[PDB]
Amino acid sequence: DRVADVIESSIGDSVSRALTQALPAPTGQNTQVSSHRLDTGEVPALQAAEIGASSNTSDESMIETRCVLNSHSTAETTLDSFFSRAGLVGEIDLPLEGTTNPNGYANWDIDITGYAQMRRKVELFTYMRFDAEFTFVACTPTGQVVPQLLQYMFVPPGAPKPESRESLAWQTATNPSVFVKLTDPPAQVSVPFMSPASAYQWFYDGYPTFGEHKQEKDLEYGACPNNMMGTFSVRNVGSSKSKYPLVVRIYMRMKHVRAWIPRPMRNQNYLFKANPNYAGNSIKPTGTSRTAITTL
Amino acid sequence: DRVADVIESSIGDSVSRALTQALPAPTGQNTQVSSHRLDTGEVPALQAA
Amino acid sequence: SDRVAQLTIGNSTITTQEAANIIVGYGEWPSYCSDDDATAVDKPTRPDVSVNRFYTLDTKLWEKSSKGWYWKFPDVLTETGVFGQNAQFHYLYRSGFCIHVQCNASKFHQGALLVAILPEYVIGTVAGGTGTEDSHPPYKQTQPGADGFELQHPYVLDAGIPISQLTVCPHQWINLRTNNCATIIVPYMNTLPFDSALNHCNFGLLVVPISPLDFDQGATPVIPITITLAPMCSEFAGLRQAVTQ
Amino acid sequence: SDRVAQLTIGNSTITTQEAANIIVGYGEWPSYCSDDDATAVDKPTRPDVSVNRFYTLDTKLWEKSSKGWYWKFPDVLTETGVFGQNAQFHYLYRSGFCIHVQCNASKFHQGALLVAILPEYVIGTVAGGTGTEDSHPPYKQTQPGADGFELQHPYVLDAGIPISQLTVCPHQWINLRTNNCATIIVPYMNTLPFDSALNHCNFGLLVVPISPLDFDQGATPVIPITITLAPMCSEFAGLRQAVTQ
Amino acid sequence: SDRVAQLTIGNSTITTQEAANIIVGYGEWPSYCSDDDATAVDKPTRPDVSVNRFYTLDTKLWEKSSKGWYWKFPDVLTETGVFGQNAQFHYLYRSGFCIHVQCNASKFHQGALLVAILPEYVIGTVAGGTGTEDSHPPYKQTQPGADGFELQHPYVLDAGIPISQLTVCPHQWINLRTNNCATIIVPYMNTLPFDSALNHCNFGLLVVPISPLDFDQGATPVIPITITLAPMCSEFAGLRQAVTQ
């Protein structure tokens, strides 16, 4: 009735084989008593790194060990512990006199790859899914608190990006905006995991357009739209010159984190956002150096 | 109550492991019938001094 | 029963008598896309044997000075075989891979290659040396296809990342005194159930000499490295005409 | 599962991939002194791990002309480590030993060492050649400690006894084409439950080349022999100040 | 447990550490003659151990040009040992054989010998070249006994038959990189229960170099091939005086 090779044909198996299981590990593994072992055929110490697996040799096999009940917690090593720490990811200037952002408003492209500390931590993984708490610390360049009213407005991609301090877009009829005085504590708000992909992608080895991919367009390599969440716009609410030079610092605290595929930690200084470029002539060693392998 | 490594600690074992036993040997060992053996995997003759 | 092995997919069989076990990337065998993990509503193609088989793509020559090479994956197999076709004809592609890198020598040669799989292997540039110029790697460097591409600054994997730590990735070594081939099975890894085999390369294969090749003169000086690989659970959807890139 | 082995005592682990099993002197594992075999009424010290561990005492160079060497035991380990201390501080000593002699070469070298344990290894002299003079071996020859001592008439083991028969003693051979190390475990052997580690040497370790070392020129000519050993079930009693000899 | 082996018959024991299993001609162990397969009514002799044992008959030198040799069997063992005697004294002979051909070299030499058993190995002549002359092979060529005989046209086995097909006969190869000896056990094969060891040779043993021997200069150039064989279940009947031929 059927052709057999069709009946076995495991084609269409949606579930993955696994091979490993997650076990509880609230504390560090304890050490159990070890005694001398003088025998043939059993060699813990001997390994074959070629295989690609880490040595499974235990302390007990390398020395006579006592017993230790390790109750040291592993809680602080979870992704949430490691990442749920507010950090600077954006800085916006709103000076009186200047070439940066006069007029009294700015449009910050939402991109956390602009600051080294936070960037390196996340670039530890290839994919990350999470919600976040954005906190906005505003004041003058001197760090002085001033009686000024601001309006922050999240502008999802495709929404009208404000062209002036009095842009019609500030009616923010559907966009979420925040109105705060610099005298009020820094504004903080909760953001979900928005993105058509299942996770944000720190590294996207590919292009996003499907074209010819000539010289001029090599600007698009590594540009993944599933990460461009839109822009964050800010203006001093009014129709006249601010009167005070402002600055807004954007801090982000990740929460409800999931991360996948760990990568080697950043090695060379960062140069540009969403672009692993490094300084070819200043390629420094991962760390410190000595004078000889036989001396400290 | 104790420290474990003290509880196992075989230190203080007065008796020796042995490994060999003395058997009765009043006479020389007898020889038993042997037949031809043409096989692989079994090499009496081969040793490692 | 561990140094010898035989890999058989489609109508291809690889053999080896000096293997070093098999690595299964992130401990997961390639599977097909769940009925609830998917979005594309059209019923896909699963050519099976005509695509899931071993393609021996290329040979490189290992020399006492070699820096190391890499191949971006989804890409590498396009233009080649029935796999390549389904990839050009369809928008969406999905699949795992069995990568078998081989290189042998004599018990008198010595050297060690690091064979690793680095997901989303984004390439960088030297930034014009001074690092003031915002240069970008060309389509020729980011997606070399077969033939692969040679590294210029392996220490940082041409991307500002320490190779010393590349081992947190499904890897395996080819130490001549020990073995003569690496075998890594990689599952489909992406943030989407399917993606375009053309503009996206789920991962890159790195083959780098960490302990240089060496030998006394008179011994055959031509030590090649050959890359053989096989797609697994290949699935395609989004049929249209054939697109190259 | 017999040519590879791992020995672990205290905080030391020896490894080997070309062993030839393990010999257990006179078929008996080192034990502690019976409560009815003993006489000394004071309660002893059994430092355990601080003394029962591997001490790699010395390296000799095997040459195409080497005659062979020997080390007297109890002694050899004095002055070295915590073991040495308990031996000087205490009058009475008792212990077994795990002796691991190692020496490797290439599959192109050849030679064979006889590694044996000769209890109560009393040394003799040539008696002034003519044999009329009643000479006696010096403290430097009878108890060389580490560094051992080279034989001058191995055929008679410098004691008028045929080495051809030395094998009635717990021995083992190091035949280069076959293995690269000897492992002999010796139990405490004396006519007393305890004795002085200083004036008495329960046995001697002989390492003698019976089949000379040889190799074609160009192959590394420096073939060393290293002696590693570990006390087992060390027990001490009769505490006083530290005495050297 | 397959590359090492020990063959023991009578008072002889062959040893080997690089064997390639054992072939049993036409899958049948040598047996004695059935009570209903026989005709000769006299009760036979079955010397057992005095005849069923290993006779190491001869050594040949394998050279880069060697063509190959053969030995006719029943015959080869006459004149040698107690077997030879029972064969001359008795009219009727019957027996199987355990043939062990040995030849070793170093892991640096190379070559491959075909060792086969060809029943009723009738020899032919070149027919005077033109093939018009009806010549016939001499008693010296058809029954060389020990010392065997060298082939002159191995391609046709000096009998107009392709050696390429000689493998349909109980054979085994001696590939230096792999093994150093062939072992074939042959049962009595004839159309009669017994026959004369003198005028009839139940089969011939062929040892032919198919892949020539080769090696770089400096390695021992004398690679011998030795033939050892043992009769099995030897039975004799038809006693008279001793006849040579």
Ligand SMILES: Cc1cc(CCCCCCCOc2ccc(C3=NCCO3)cc2)on1
């Ligand atoms: C009210 C209100 C709230 C806001 C700001 C909301 C910001 C939500 C940001 C979520 C950001 O997720 C990211 C994922 C990836 C990257 C990225 N940058 C380089 C490539 O990846 C940046 C942000 O503004 N107003």
